[PDB]
């Protein structure tokens, strides 16, 4: 019954910005820790950002810190990822993920492709 629907992927020039959304339903979003995890073609998943349940509190992979911002609105049951200063190496499918409070990833969305290219 858990639904996680990402949107907003597209083409970005290097240096550009893009905002991803994740619409969540079928569970108590506000009491869930949420994450962005990306996966480049032929590679394993890479954790990008976390935001704690309730009122939030964030963490980032070192290589995105200062460029990317994760945010949430519990009433809207929506997670966002604002990506700035994008580079080619950020090209990937980006997934919205619900984590158990221990940290394992219980539910993943279908993903949205981000393409960063000149």
């Amino acid at each position: 019954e858990v639904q996680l629907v990402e949107s907003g992927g597209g083409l970005v020039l290097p240096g550009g910005s893009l905002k991803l959304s994740c619409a969540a339903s079928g569970f108590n979003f506000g009491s869930s820790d949420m994450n962005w995890v990306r996966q480049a073609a032929g590679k394993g998943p890479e954790w990008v950002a976390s935001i704690e349940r309730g009122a939030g509190g964030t963490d980032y992979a070192d290589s995105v810190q200062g460029r990317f911002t994760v945010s949430r609105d519990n009433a809207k049951s929506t997670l966002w990822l604002q990506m700035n200063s994008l580079k080619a190496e950020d090209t990937a499918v980006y997934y919205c993920v619900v984590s158990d409070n221990s940290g394992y990833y219980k539910y993943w969305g279908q993903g949205t492709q981000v393409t960063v290219s000149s």
Binding site: S102, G103, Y104, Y105, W108
Partner: protein
């Protein structure tokens, strides 16, 4: 950072065979406070997102058949499929969630062998 290393990179298996795949973490993921390994396995079927199979190294997630099992502790982990079904052809990943950054292996491709 904890680094996760999987082996083999690929394995070709025929229907009904036993298949074993391995994952090593560069540091132990056993938490002394609860005696749990912070180790998960995911299955990624073609064109789909990853799906949770196993957490705490050996606990099967709901909706996962008994032919899947996880074992190991500390740094050394295994995923076993006791009888490969066609639907089990997929890429399998291990994941440590002991400490940030959470990290993944590079996957093992389980391919169908005629």
């Amino acid at each position: 950072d904890i680094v996760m290393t999987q082996s083999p990179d690929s394995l070709a298996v025929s229907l009904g065979e036993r298949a074993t795949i391995n994952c090593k973490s560069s540091q132990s993921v056993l938490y002394s406070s609860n005696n749990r390994n912070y180790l998960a396995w995911y299955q990624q079927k073609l064109g789909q997102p990853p799906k949770l199979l196993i957490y705490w190294a050996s606990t099967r997630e709901s909706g996962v058949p008994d032919r899947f099992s996880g074992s190991g502790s500390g740094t050394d982990f295994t995923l076993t499929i006791s009888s490969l079904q066609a639907e089990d052809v997929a890429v399998y990943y291990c994941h440590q969630y002991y400490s940030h950054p959470q990290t993944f292996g590079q996957g093992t491709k389980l391919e169908l062998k005629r």
